[PDB]
């Protein structure tokens, strides 16, 4: 197995010079061996990617999927440790930079089929990972406008060369 996510909280950066932008805090948290399909968990993770901590908690509190409660618990734990151990000033000043689901260690069980035949069930388990970055959530990428998009087209036109010649 791999347990690199846990180690990511223990990296100490060198002290910053006074004339240096304040490095945003980063909190890595995980729950391992959740009795839930990683494929089902992925939808919740994707849902809350890039959202503020409060917005993510609000969205998860009203979601019917089982994984929503687990993700909410993980997010609340991440917030608590961000305040206690990672010197985050405001609880709400956190956004989900990364949230993914990973395969867990699964168990194989037998499903009995109808003619003395069978299948192999997998008691599926998943991991859930979050990185919480301090600061307001980064603005959503603006849709590209006709002006910019035509600018790109004209740049492509100008890039043209006379190919296969002197």
């Amino acid at each position: 197995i791999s347990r690199k996510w846990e180690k990511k909280n223990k990296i100490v950066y060198p002290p910053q010079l006074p004339g240096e932008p304040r490095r945003p805090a980063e909190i890595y948290h995980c729950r391992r061996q959740i009795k839930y399909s990683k494929d089902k968990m992925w939808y919740l993770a994707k849902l809350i990617r890039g959202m503020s901590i409060d917005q993510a908690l609000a969205q998860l509190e009203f979601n019917d999927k089982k994984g929503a409660k687990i993700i909410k618990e993980v997010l609340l734990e991440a917030q608590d440790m961000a305040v206690r151990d990672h010197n985050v000033e405001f609880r709400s000043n956190l956004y989900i930079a990364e949230s993914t689901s990973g395969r867990g260690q699964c168990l194989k069980r037998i499903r009995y089929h109808g003619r003395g035949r069978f299948g192999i069930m997998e008691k599926v388990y998943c991991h859930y990972f979050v990185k919480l970055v301090e600061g307001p959530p980064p603005p959503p990428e603006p849709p590209k406008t006709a002006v910019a998009h035509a600018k790109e087209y004209i740049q492509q036109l100008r890039s043209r060369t006379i190919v296969h010649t002197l």
Binding site: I53, D54, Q55, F90, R91, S92, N93
Partner: protein, 287 residues
């Protein structure tokens, strides 16, 4: 030149800001207790004259930050970005409280100030504009008013519908810019130094310094635009969602100079009004 006037006023504004910040150095932990109905009993230890009710809201949650428009620090309305001074009790006021009258007044003043900025930076250079005052009118009045004296070259000119729509477009540009409402409790001396040119603002500053016990005056700035505030204002200009400069009525008793009252109407994001209701409000905001 008007650009030079704005530049020097901003320079004085920043000078006073730095002066007060230096006057309050280091960090003195002041205890501010949330006396609000929700989350009661919480305490924030805060940096004296540095932290703000906005910072307290940030500690509470993002919902408080987005929904809170004013603060009753010790029963008095404080701007969300006005540095806290002493340990106190704090309660956050939103637009949907049972009695939001204070929040309504603050929104009304802030909308008037935005109108003032738009007016001062609308007309062509040759014409001269003098922002006399933002009369304090009840919300029931249906339109926030800002009083301005235009040039004699324009005393015979009334804005067209397209001019009014350009004013609204400038106001919406300001809203989109989303500039915070900076505050300063500034003594009448520095206030007068900043507004030396504007006779109207000078005498208004004198009036305010008379009314209050000391000579402390409320200066407010959105961006590059500084004005005397009748009271606390909104945190940011993005609180406004629907905004319209509706009319310009020339006050009837104008012998010395012609005072034009720019009337407009606004509603915040929290209290958006349907299109038809908004049209009716616009109609009634032209009186």
């Amino acid at each position: 030149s008007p650009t030079e006037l704005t530049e020097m006023r901003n320079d004085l504004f920043n000078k006073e800001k730095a002066r007060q910040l230096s006057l309050t150095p280091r960090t003195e932990k002041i205890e501010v207790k949330h006396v609000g109905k929700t989350d009661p009993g919480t305490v924030f230890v805060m940096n004296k004259n540095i932290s703000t009710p906005y910072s307290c809201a940030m500690h509470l949650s993002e919902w408080y930050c987005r929904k809170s428009i004013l603060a009753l620090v010790d029963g008095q309305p404080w701007d969300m970005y006005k540095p806290l001074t002493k340990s106190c009790e704090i309660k956050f006021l939103t637009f949907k409280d049972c009695d939001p009258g204070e929040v309504n007044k603050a929104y009304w003043r802030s909308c008037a100030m935005m109108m003032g900025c738009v007016i001062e930076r609308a007309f062509k250079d040759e014409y001269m504009v003098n922002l006399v005052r933002a009369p304090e009118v009840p919300v029931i009045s249906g339109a926030f008013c800002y009083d301005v004296v235009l040039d004699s070259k324009l005393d015979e000119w009334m804005p067209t519908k397209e001019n009014l729509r350009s004013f609204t477009k400038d106001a919406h540009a300001l809203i989109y810019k989303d500039l915070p409402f900076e505050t300063l409790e500034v003594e009448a001396k520095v206030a007068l130094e900043i507004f030396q040119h504007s006779k109207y603002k000078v005498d208004f500053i004198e009036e305010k310094a008379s009314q209050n016990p000391e000579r402390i005056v409320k200066l407010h700035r959105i961006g590059d635009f500084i004005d005397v505030s009748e009271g606390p204002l909104i945190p940011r200009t993005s609180i406004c969602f629907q905004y319209e400069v509706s009319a310009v009525h020339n006050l009837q008793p104008t012998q010395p100079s012609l005072i034009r009252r720019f009337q407009g109407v606004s509603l915040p994001v929290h209290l958006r009004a349907h299109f038809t209701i908004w049209d009716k409000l616009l109609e009634r905001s032209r009186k």
